[PDB]
Amino acid sequence: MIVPVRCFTCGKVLADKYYEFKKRVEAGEDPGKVLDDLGVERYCCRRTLLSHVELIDQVMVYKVY
Amino acid sequence: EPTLTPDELWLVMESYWKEKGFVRQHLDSYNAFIDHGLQDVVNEFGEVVPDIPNFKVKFGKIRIGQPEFQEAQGQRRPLYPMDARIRNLTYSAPLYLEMIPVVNGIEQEPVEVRIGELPIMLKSKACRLYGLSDEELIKLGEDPKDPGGYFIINGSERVIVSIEDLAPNKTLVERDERQNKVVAKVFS
Amino acid sequence: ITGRRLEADIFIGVIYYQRLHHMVADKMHARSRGPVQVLTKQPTEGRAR
Amino acid sequence: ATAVYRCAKCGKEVELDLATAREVRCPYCGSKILYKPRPRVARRVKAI
Amino acid sequence: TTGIPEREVREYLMKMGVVPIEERRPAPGLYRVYLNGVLIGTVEDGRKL
Amino acid sequence: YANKRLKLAGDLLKDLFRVAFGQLVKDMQYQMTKTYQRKGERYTFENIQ
Amino acid sequence: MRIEVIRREENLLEFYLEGEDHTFANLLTETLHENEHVTFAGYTIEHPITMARKPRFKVVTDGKITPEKALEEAAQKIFDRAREVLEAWKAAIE
DNA sequence: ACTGTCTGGACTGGTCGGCGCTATGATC
DNA sequence: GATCATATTGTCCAGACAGT
Ligand SMILES: [Zn+2]
Ligand SMILES: [Zn+2]
After folding, report:
1. Shortest Cα distance from A58 to chain B (angstroms)?
2. Checking DSSP bridges between strand G56-61 and strand B68-70, what pairing results, if any?
3. Which of helix, strand or coil describes residue B116?
4. A44 is annotated as contributing to ligand binding
5. Would you tell me which CATH number, out of the four given (1.10.10.970, 3.30.1050.10, 3.30.1360.10, 3.40.640.10), belongs to the domain G1-94?
6. Interface test mutation site (partner B, options E6, E34, E36, max chain B beta carbons within 10 A)
7. In the CATH hierarchy, which top-level class contains the domain D7-48?
8. Which residues form a coiled coil (chain A)?
9. Which of B32, F39, G19, G73 is 20 to 30 A (C-alpha) from B68?
10. Which residues of A are less than 8 Å from D38 in CB distance?
11. G81, containing H or E segment
12. Which 3-state string (H, E, C) describes chain E?
């Protein structure tokens, strides 16, 4: 439900640049160029960043205590 | 004019899926049953004649209330699917039927009594989640993506599976080669 | 292991893979002795019992 | 043998005795579903 | 589909020009008209109806 | 599929409600008969509601 | 690092190497291959789970030098090569 | 002696887990 | 309001059997 800290393949950290990538994608920018500008070269890290779906906000609304 | 591309037909298909949904048959069937099925059953039963001279009870209109549960203490509170699931309760609503007593052939003042509790299909017209937005469903502990269309019985979700039966009151002719006969069957 | 080039060009891609609920943690069952049925004096049925 | 519980809906603290409770409900909002709060003691969790 | 009352459909079919089965008996040159599997009448021009 | 009809949840619910209402009607008739036979005619007709 | 001798012939030495894996084992075998007095040199992992950190070796010489001496020269060659590569890397970085 | 008819029976093994169900009306 | 008797009586293959 939250972005993984590291890439599942090579362990490259991607969670720091995920929110900027999501913000730039929603602004109409090309996701490939945004990934290229963020240093995401290998397509495994691109797989991790592109295929992630954020769902933690939909879980926080239900309280468990 | 150029022929339509498959993208436009996909847009129309998506509009159909957005309008009706994916559990439409359950919701439509339950709404039809609630609107006139109970009244049809009551009318087909008609009346009850006990062993009392010159006395009978005539059935009137039947209505369904809001989904609520009566506590063991005595208080009556509205019921929600999450509460029914957690507390192992049945998501049902009371059923009220008007009874008109007939004495010596003259109808008396009708009396409305409770005849039982009928389980309520999720996201149906008789359900408390009908017409609610995503935020309202979230506030009630319900996932907005839940399609509904099922029943909660003693805290367990029960879904009715449709049965692919033959057409009622329809005659079909077939030939049995082994028995060397022609047989037509109807289900009345 | 060897570090040498493979003699054939290996097909590699990205495939959507799903993990199913059939896990070995819920399927491993080992019984030596324990409860038996009252009627038949035979071992019971099920990993839970 | 009293204990402190958290309400499921309102979330406020509810204190009652399970042994001698006539009714399990929240006195603030009337909810009959309560949550047992987590103990304040520390626990050790292995990082994978 | 969701069911609709059959009386309105039968009245509409009778109004549109379907001769009732009691008035006219079936003939080899006649088109049999069925409503929900029930023979309700006959018409001369089935295709037009 | 022209000869096949799908029994949805509404029809099964209607059949179950019919069976339950028949049982309730029989029980109500028996209760009314028993109360009339036990308490008497004066109690029954003094308050029919 | 622990050495457990399996068997010892007149010119054959079979032993285990606890605590090591393919990384050191392959390098040691290929360094032993460089010696002209070593006729057979090979390693294997019996099981990738139970024997993951315990490869099995087999060194056969021609009788001129002992297999233990051949392994010692191979290890010394590995040490010298690693030191030379480290020196070259340090020189190239600055 | 043939021939169609009535009746009885069995319906591949194992495993996983879930989900209900095992009283009621009439005195004293 | 507590207890007590009673609680209803699915096709196909093979063997045995009236009918002609
Ligand atoms: Zn990567
Ligand atoms: Zn509360």
Report:
1. 9
2. unpaired
3. strand
4. yes
5. 3.30.1360.10
6. E36
7. mainly beta
8. none
9. B32
10. 65
11. helix G67-93
12. CCCCCHHHHHHHHHHHCCEECCCCCCCCCCEEEEECCEEEEEECCCCCC
Of B71, B73, B83, which is closest to D33 when you measure between CB atoms? B83
Question: Which residues on neighbouring strands pair with residue B185, listed in sequence order?
Answer: B172
CA-based torsion, E44, E48, F5, F7: positive or negative: negative
- Give the other-Cβ count within 10 Å of G18's Cβ: 12
B167–chain F Cβ distance below 8 A for any pair:
yes
Chains that touch B (3 or more CB pairs under 8 A): A, D, E, F
Question: At B13, phi and psi to the nearest 5?
Answer: -60, -40
End-to-end CA distance of chain D: 38
The separation, in Å, between residue B177 CA and nucleotide I20 C1' comes to 26
| Residue in this structure with the two tokens 């890397």, named with its chain if needed | G89
Chain G nearest-CA distance from C24, in A, is: 18
So where are chain D's domains? 7-48
Q: Find the nucleotide nearest C27 (Cα to C1′).
A: H16
Distance, in angstroms, between B166 CA and closest chain F CA? 4
Nearest to F20 by CA among B74, B92, B168, B148: B92
| Nearest Cα to Cα of residue G33 among B76, C49, C2 | C2
Nearest to B115 by CA among C14, F15, C42, F25: F25
Look up residue B37 and give its DSSP letter.
I
Among residues B124, B118, B162, B138, which one has the least CA distance to residue B28? B124
Is D7 annotated as belonging to a binding site? Answer: no
C43 touches strand H (CB under 7 A): no
Query: Are the CB atoms for B39 and B64 separated by under 8 Å?
Result: no
Distance B181 CA to H8 C1' (A): 25
**Which residue of B83, B138, B139, B140 to mutate against D (max D Cβ within 10 Å)?**
B83
Cα(B40)–Cα(B43) distance, integer angstroms: 5
In this complex, the residue of D8, D23, D33 whose CB is nearest that of residue B73 is: D23
Each domain of chain G, given as residue ranges in start order, spans 1-94
Contact call for B29 and E2, based on CB within 8 A: yes
Sort strands B172-176 and D3-7 into parallel, antiparallel or unpaired. Answer: unpaired
B33, exposed or middle or buried, with CB in 10 Å at 0-12, 13-18, 19+?
buried
Phi, psi torsion values for B168, nearest 5 degrees: -70, 145
Cα F48 from chain centre:
19
Give the containing element (helix H, strand E) for F24. helix F9-39
Question: Which domains occur in chain A, in start order?
Answer: 1-65 (1.10.10.60)
CA distance C17 to C15: 6
